[PDB]
Amino acid sequence: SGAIYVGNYRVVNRHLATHNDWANLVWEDSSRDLLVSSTTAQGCDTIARCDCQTGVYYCSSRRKHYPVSFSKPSLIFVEASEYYPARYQSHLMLAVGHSEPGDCGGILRCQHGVVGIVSTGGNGLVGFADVRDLLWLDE
Ligand SMILES: COCc1ccccc1NC(=O)N1CCC[C@H](C(N)=O)C1
Numbered sequence: 001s002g003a004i005y006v007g008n009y010r011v012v013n014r015h016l017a018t019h020n021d022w023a024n025l026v027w028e029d030s031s032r033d034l035l036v037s038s039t040t041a042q043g044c045d046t047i048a049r050c051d052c053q054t055g056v057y058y059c060s061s062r063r064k065h066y067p068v069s070f071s072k073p074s075l076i077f078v079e080a081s082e083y084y085p086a087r088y089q090s091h092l093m094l095a096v097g098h099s100e101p102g103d104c105g106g107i108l109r110c111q112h113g114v115v116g117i118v119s120t121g122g123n124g125l126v127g128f129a130d131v132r133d134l135l136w137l138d139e
């Protein structure tokens, strides 16, 4: 679990979105595993606008933050799950690191701000859904 709160928006993993999120839907994309809903309270996260490939992520299954090197956002094959069939997920960045189910939603940050959220894992790898291209999150 976890979310990004920026302006009047809440960014969450689409497969973990609630009834309130879908009732206040702004935008969703199954191919990215992202959903943005509207909030009544003002969010104060800064979204990074950069091509950083190093940062720090929060891993809930370890109650710890880890530094990582991560790949550029790309189309990566993701195995079938209870939420989606086997498919290419777009805008996904991989890193070598721990991640298990329950870790989705943990934030990945660089010195510029929030880069993305944990979305995939397994095999000693962790995948993050990028949010840096969503320029409208501020305006
Ligand atoms: C982050 O931990 C997830 C995980 C860790 C370790 C092993 C498997 C997973 N399961 C995982 O990748 N999926 C979870 C459900 C939806 C995800 C998606 N974006 O399509 C795919």
Ligand SMILES: [Zn+2]
Binding pocket: 048, 049, 050, 051, 052, 110, 111, 112, 113
């Ligand atoms: Zn950066």
